Amino acid sequence: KTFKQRRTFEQRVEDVRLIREQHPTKIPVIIERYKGEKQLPVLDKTKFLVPDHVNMSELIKIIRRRLQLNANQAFFLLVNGHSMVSVSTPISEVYESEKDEDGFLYMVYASQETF
């Protein structure tokens, strides 16, 4: 079901290396709904190429737009399994500290803070 379950470690590593070659200014992001999630819809895709200058606050706005949320629906985004310390950090900086060993940046969203 999950991205990591669908693709071999070798396949995930090779895909990140191709994004490096073909979209060298983009961060490779996996964005998945919490397996428990009742309220929020599923995204149309899993793998996103994020411009490396956008900060986490803007990425949250981007995902809220893509999910077509309204103003009062709650949305919580985990990065690398945990809460974001700050939304002001450029994703280039978040990537260097929070990247997976495969080279993807993993995010999960839910309508509750309690995942």
Ligand X SMILES: Cc1nsc(N(C)CC(N)=O)c1C#N
Site for ligand X, rule CB under 6 A: 17, 20-21
Other CB atoms closer than 10 Å to residue 68's CB: what's the count?
8
Report whether 95 contacts 27 (CB < 8 A): yes
| End-to-end Cα distance, the chain | 18
20 binds, among Cl ion, ligand X, none (CB under 5 to 8 A by kind): ligand X
25 contact, one of ligand X, Cl ion, none, CB 5-8 Å limit per kind: Cl ion
For the bound state, the minimum distance from the C-beta of residue 18 to ligand X, rounded and expressed in Å, comes to 7
Minimum distance of ligand X from residue 69's CB (angstroms): 35
Angle 2-93-3 from CA coordinates, rounded to 5°: 5
Query: Token match 């990140």: residue?
Result: 16
What does 6 interact with, of ligand X, Cl ion, none (CB < 5 to 8 A by kind)?
none
Is residue 26 left, alpha or beta, with left meaning phi > 0 and alpha meaning psi from -120 to 50?
Answer: beta
The footprint of Cl ion on residues 9-48 (CB under 5 A) is 23, 25
- Closest distance to ligand X from the beta carbon of 48 (Å): 19
Task: Quote the least distance from Cβ 75 to ligand X, whole Å.
Answer: 32
* Residues at the contact surface with Cl ion, assessed by CB under 5 A: 23, 25
